[PDB]
Structure formats: C-alpha cells, structure tokens
Design a protein around this nucleic acid. Structure first.
Ligand SMILES: [Mg+2]
Ligand SMILES: [Mg+2]
Ligand SMILES: [Mg+2]
Ligand SMILES: [Mg+2]
Ligand SMILES: [Mg+2]
Lengths: 51, 290, 95, 50, 247
RNA sequence: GGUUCGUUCCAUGGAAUUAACGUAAACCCUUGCUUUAUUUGUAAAUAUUAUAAAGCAGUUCACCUUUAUAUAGGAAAUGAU
C-alpha cells in the first residue's frame, strides 16, 4: 500500500533538497556558490525572540 | 505568649494613629510663624524654572570648574578666573549658552522632532526622566550601547513604533510600513555628561544629528553642536540645566499642538514615510486599472 | 518586479529609501582589488579587499570598502556600502 | 592625531547640502529632517579660539 | 479612506533607546509609586509575611530582555519596600503591581511509602549492594537470625560479614530483641552481607522509627551506589589500557 | 578586575550588537522513590525480590562564611536526605 505525501515546498525534505541541488550542479557551467544562495533565499524561517 | 501578640493590636493602631496623626499635623503645624522657605532640594523636579538667572546658576554650583591642571585649554573662552585651585566658569557665559540651547530644544520640539535627554550618572536618573516627560521625549540613564544610531537596524530591530498625526494620535493603515521601516534616530540629543559618553556624541556627528552638552572645564567643546559651559559634576546644576531644557520642550510641544487644532501643521511628512505614500497609490493604481 | 529576488538591496532600500530600479541606474565600478593574507594558527587566510565607487552622474559620489574570502561577496558588500555613503560633491558649472 | 574628527559644528551645513538635490536626478528632493528648519537661524558659536 | 496626508513615526515607549525598554518602563513605574506612597507607614521586617518573589531568570523570559542582575537587584528592593506598607493602608494599585512579581512555582512532591507491619508483627525491609536484593523479616524475638534457611555461621564463613549483616541491631544494642529471617539473592559474600545491613535497618525502623539518627551515624541507612564498571572497547578493562608503543 | 568544572556568571571598556558548529543541555546504563503490570519469574501473603513502561529527585533544604554589595563559596562518618 502507498501513502504518497505531496510536499508543497522542496525545502521541507532533505532527500528532495540534496537531489535538486545535485542536478543543478551537474552542469559544467553551473555556478556552485550562486546556486546555494538561491536556495537559502527561498528558505523562510519564522521570526523568533532570541531571549 | 501575649508578648508576641502585643505587636498585633499595635499594628491595628497604625491606621488609627496615622489618621489622627495626620489630622493633628494640619492644625498645630504652621502656627508659630511663617517660614520663608527659599530652597528645597527637590525643587528642580517638582517645578523647574522656565529660565535660569545668575543667582540660580551660582546657587547650583554651576560655576565650579575642575582643577586648574585638569583643563582643556581650548575651552578657556568661558573661564572667568581661578580660585580655590579650580577654574571658575563665567556665570554670564552659562546663562547665555543655556538660553540659546533652550531655544534649540523648543524649535526642534515645535517642528515635531524627536528629542533624547541623556544623563548617565549614579543620581541622574530622576532628572532625565522628569525632563523627558515635560518635553514628551525619550530618556537614557544607562550606558549607551555603541551602535544604536549607526547600527540601529540590528539593535533597535524588534522595538515597536507607531504612526501619529497632527494632534499626535495613532493612524491606522501603516501596519505594513511598520515592518519594513528602519528604526528611528533622535533629532536632538541633550547630553548631561559629554565627557563620559563620547561614543554617543561621535555617532551623532557621523549621523548628522545636532547635540547639546554641558561642557565642563576639562571637556572638549568640539564634541557637541551647542555647548553649555557649566559644572556637570554637581547633581544640583544638572537638574537646573535639564529642568530649563525640559520646560523649553514643553513650551514647544504646546505651540505645535495649539497650531494643529487650527489646521496649521508645523512640519511636513518625513522622507521615509513620504516614500511609502507614492508607493501606496501605485499599488492602488492597479486596482483602478484591473 | 523580479529584479532583486536575492534580498541584497532590501536593507539598502530602507537606508536610502528609493526603488530597486533606481539603484541599478547608478554608475558602479570596482577600482581596487587587493589579495590580502593573514597568518593564523590554522595557516594562511587569504582575503580579497575591494573598493567600489557608486555615483549618480550629476554630483553624487560614494566610496565603499569591504573584504571577504570570496571575491564575489566582497564586491557586493562594497557596492551596498558605497551606495549608502554617497555625498553631494560641489562642482563648478557642473563640469 | 589619534583622536577622531568631530564634525558636529557642521551638521546643518552638511545635512542641508544632502537635502538640496536628490540622488535620482530629475526628481524633486525629498523632505529634509525635521530639525533642519528648527536650527535654521541658530548657528553655533565660535569655539577653540584662545 | 486612504492614508492621512500628515504622518510621522514616533516611538511607543519613552525608553526606546535604552538597553531593555520593557524592563525600565516597569521599573520607572515602581519609582513613581515609591514617591507618592512613601508617606504611608511601614511594618517591621519580622511581621511581614514571607513572599516568594520572581528571580532574574523569570523576568528575563517574560520581558524578552537581557535584564542586568545589578539593575534588577535594586528593582527588587523597591518591591520589598512597597510590600512592607500596612495592608489596610496599602492602596489598590500597589497591590496589583506587586502580584506580578510573585513566583507561583510549586516543586514536585515525592514522599516515600511507610513500611507497614504484618498482622503477625513482621516488617519487611529491602536492601541491595552491587548485585544483591535482601529481604529481612524482623519480629520481636530472642535474637535468632536465619539467612536463606541457614544460621549466620553456616552461611557466612567470615565473621566480618556476620557482624556487617546485623550491624544495625548491634549498633543500637538490640540483637537480643528481634528475630530476623532473611532471604538474599545474587551477589557475593560481602555484597550480600552489606545488603542485609540496609534491609534490617529499614525493617528495624518500622518498629522503632526513633533509631534513624543512630543508624545514620552507624552507616546502615546509606545505600552504597558503587557498581562494577563496564569494559570499554580499546581497553583491557574498564580503565586499564594496553601497552602503548612509542616507536 | 573577580568568579566558575567551564568564554560559566557578574562588573566594566573613548565600540560594540548578534548568528552557526563544538561546549553546555538532553540522551543510554546505573542509584532512591512513586504509579502501572504478576507469567514462563517470586516460600507465604493483605505484595516485599525480580521483570520494565512512565514520572519525580540534589547541593534541594539547614548551618557557617561572603568581594565592588553585583555574581557566590565553604564544610564531607556524628544537620536533614
Ligand atoms: Mg566634570
Ligand atoms: Mg572485574
Ligand atoms: Mg563585551
Ligand atoms: Mg505461573
Ligand atoms: Mg522494583
């Protein structure tokens, strides 16, 4: 039996995140340092009170 | 065991004795003769003076400079002479520089400016807090955190703000603006000890903010915009100086509010808020279009 | 308008208070690019120090300096640090 | 020469020049700080003169 | 329905540029109540009922600020001062503001169950030492002690272990007033002996609870927690290591 | 400059405010107690070994001493536990 879970964003799972980033970096012309910043900028974190 | 219970009925008498004692203090007191009370320690806070005379400045030890050796030779333009091994600041130079500063505090408060009274010393907390209430300004009675002006984005990040109007009442509709807006900076800093906190004053110079300070005989006068040559080590002189400046702001805030009830705003919208206006209609322009 | 989705100009958009489309209309240029090195307990640490000038072209100019381990991060720092340090430069007859 | 350079006696001059023209040429300058018009006619006093 | 033509940002609190805005706003309030209500009488420090005020960590959390320890110590003195005011004469405002500083924490209660006495008068104590688990049934008797159905001399061939087993009765001088029927399991000779010591002590305290101070000084109430350490990889034993060759 | 097992905590500095990793915390075994369960384990039993799920517990209280009054420390078989 299958319990496929549909994810809204690709950052909520480590498996899907490392595979997407790997396909992007497979190109010889891929800007490594730039593709990582594009992903982090898409990762929204909730505001918090440090104290 | 009554020896331990005899303290209860004594406590039950405190309300009665206090009431009767207070009543007795109203009749008999002041019977003998009338006293000419011409000085109370806490008079610069309960009712600070509108202006300071040569006698008020001298009575408050505002002319006591530091030792002759511990002096900044640049600030010798205000020294009257030497006596008791100290430099005597000219009383007339202090009154003139004080009135001029009181004019700056009034105009800045009259134009809707944000003032910041800064006194950082053991007993300068009640003085600065009182002056801020009169002028409707902000106070600071602790060590100035370096970077609160040049690095306000981080320090004053979570502190809440509000948007007001002519009559200083909140305006609903700027919620989205109070999250992208960057923190505020004082339009006029009134320091009561420029010798101690030079990190605050330098930031104001870097940030193009006017400043007012009490320049003692050993303080560098080039640190503030408007100097008030006087004794900053005397807690009685600081209360008078700050008291006069507090009344100035109060008198300025009154004119501003009196002019707003007549539909005469004495200030235009700040540049940051002004920008958020044209963008607001820009977003609404799409509604009319689509 | 999708111009700045990296979040780099957002903070600068608050200090300067002007659209992102206008920040790109400025004349920026990387003048100096040094390769400094610092000896530490873990060996040399080589950094790039870059100075960038930002100018409007009609009497405004700003100088910004920054450094980082990556030559790209250093140029972005000076760019934003140079656009917020702009000052009006007086000029006779605008020439 | 260790000490820093304090330009507090020129805040009005510096601040006024920064508000004369807009960074984005062709547009009117934005409203200046609320204190620019408060000390308009109250210049500092001459200091550091023996 | 659009925005007002004139508008400007203004700080909500006057202590906008301070280190901890929210804290000073509450501290200055106390100072304001300490100037107008200072003429009211005071109660001696020995007559004011005790109160558990909040700690520096509790205030740091609710306010979300990194309050300074020294600045908070001087603020707590105000609360203690405003608390000494006569209750009847104490105003309503001081009462409420003083309730926000009370620490309403309740520690967990873990009370041990008392060892009962059987209908026949036998109390069961339990003791353990490093592998063992003793169960001594103490009753009023002539001093007969049986361990696992055998006499003390038939089970412990070492007189040192016999005395340690009944040390509780020996230190209190009650060997000739109780009959002990013990049943031990696991452990060695001494390990079982030390376990029987703690078992009889607990069982003895069920009959005469006032002997605990004496058994305390005799060392028959403490549960020795020492245990054989495990062997660790890379080591020959728990601590011993193999020969280290420099070259 | 003190303190702490510890960049721990407090104070302070004419520059600081913060983030991540390690540290710390927490986790596993063990110690005392509480509740649940009683077979294949326990002599009996009104339930006390064992078995194993969850929860609580410490330097906590008491005593002594204590700097700048801010942070605390000492005592170790004859205070409690
Ligand atoms: Mg002085
Ligand atoms: Mg072994
Ligand atoms: Mg520090
Ligand atoms: Mg069975
Ligand atoms: Mg058990």
């Amino acid at each position: 039996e299958f319990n496929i879970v549909n994810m809204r964003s690709f950052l909520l799972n480590s498996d899907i995140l490392t595979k997407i980033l790997a396909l992007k970096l497979k190109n010889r012309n891929a800007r490594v340092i730039k593709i990582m910043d594009v992903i982090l900028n898409k990762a929204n974190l909730p505001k918090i009170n440090r104290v | 065991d009554e020896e331990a219970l005899k303290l209860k009925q004594q406590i039950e008498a405190i309300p009665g004795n206090f009431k009767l004692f207070k009543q007795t203090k109203a009749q008999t007191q002041k019977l003998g003769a009338g006293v000419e009370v011409r000085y109370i320690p806490e008079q610069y806070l309960r009712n600070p003076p509108s202006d300071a005379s040569l006698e008020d400045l001298m009575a408050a030890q505002a002319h006591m400079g530091h030792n002759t050796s511990l002096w900044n030779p640049a600030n010798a333009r205000y020294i009257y002479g030497v006596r008791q091994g100290i430099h005597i600041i000219s009383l007339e130079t202090t009154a003139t520089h004080l009135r001029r500063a009181a004019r700056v505090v009034e105009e800045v408060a009259y134009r809707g400016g944000l003032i910041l009274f800064v006194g950082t010393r053991p007993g300068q907390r009640p003085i600065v807090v009182r002056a801020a209430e009169l002028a409707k300004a902000c106070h600071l009675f602790t060590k100035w955190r370096p970077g609160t002006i040049t690095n306000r984005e981080q320090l004053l990040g979570g502190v809440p703000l509000t948007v007001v109007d002519e009559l200083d009442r909140p305006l609903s509709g700027f919620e989205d603006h109070l999250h992208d807006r960057r923190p505020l900076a004082p339009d006029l800093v009134v320091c009561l000890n420029p010798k101690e906190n030079m990190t605050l004053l330098y930031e104001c110079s870097l940030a193009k903010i006017p400043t007012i300070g009490i320049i003692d005989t050993n303080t560098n006068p080039s640190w503030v915009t408007y100097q008030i040559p006087a004794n900053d080590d005397s807690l009685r002189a600081t209360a008078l100086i700050s008291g006069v400046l507090g009344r100035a702001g109060e008198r300025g805030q009154k004119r501003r509010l009196e002019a707003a009830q007549r539909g005469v705003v004495t200030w235009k919208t700040p540049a940051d808020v002004q920008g958020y206006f044209e963008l607001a209609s820009a977003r609404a322009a799409d509604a009319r279009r689509r | 308008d999708g111009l700045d989705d990296k979040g780099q100009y957002q903070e600068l958009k608050k200090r300067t208070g002007m659209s992102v489309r206008q920040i790109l209309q400025l004349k920026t240029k990387k003048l100096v690019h040094r390769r400094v090195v610092n000896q530490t307990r873990l060996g040399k640490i080589a950094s790039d120090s870059v100075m960038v000038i930002a100018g409007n072209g009609d009497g405004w100019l700003g100088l910004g300096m920054a450094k980082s381990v990556e030559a790209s991060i250093a140029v972005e720092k000076a760019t934003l640090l140079a656009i917020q340090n702009m000052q009006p430069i007086p000029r006779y007859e605008n020439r | 020469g260790k000490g820093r350079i304090f330009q507090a006696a020129k805040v009005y001059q510096r601040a006024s020049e920064a508000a004369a023209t807009n960074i984005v040429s062709g547009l009117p300058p934005r409203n200046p700080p609320l204190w620019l018009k408060a000390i308009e006619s109250i210049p500092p006093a001459e200091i550091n003169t023996r | 329905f659009k925005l007002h033509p004139y508008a400007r940002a203004v700080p909500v609190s006057p202590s906008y540029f301070t280190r901890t805005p929210r804290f000073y706003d509450n501290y200055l309030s106390l100072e304001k109540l300490m100037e107008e209500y200072e003429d009211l009488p005071v109660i001696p420090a020995t007559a004011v009922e005790r109160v558990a005020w909040k700690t520096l960590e509790d205030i740091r959390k609710e306010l979300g600020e990194q309050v300074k320890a020294s600045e908070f110590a001087r603020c707590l003195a105000l609360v203690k001062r405003l608390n000494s005011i006569h209750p009847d004469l104490k105003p309503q405002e001081i009462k409420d503001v003083l309730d926000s500083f009370r620490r309403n924490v309740q520690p967990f209660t873990n009370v041990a169950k008392p060892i009962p006495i059987d209908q026949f008068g036998r109390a069961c104590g339990v003791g353990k030492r490093k592998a063992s688990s003793a169960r001594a049934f103490v009753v009023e008797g002539t001093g007969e002690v049986l361990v696992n159905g055998k006499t003390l001399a038939e089970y412990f061939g070492r007189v040192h272990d016999r005395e340690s087993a009944v040390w509780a009765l020996r230190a209190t001088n009650r060997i000739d007033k109780y009959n002990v029927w013990v049943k031990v399991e696991g452990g060695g000779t001494t390990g079982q002996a030390e376990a029987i010591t703690l078992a009889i002590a607990k069982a003895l305290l069920a009959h005469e609870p006032a002997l605990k101070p004496a058994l305390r000084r005799a060392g028959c109430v403490t549960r020795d927690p020492r245990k054989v350490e495990r062997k660790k990889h890379g080591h020959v034993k728990a601590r011993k290591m193999p020969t280290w060759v420099k070259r």
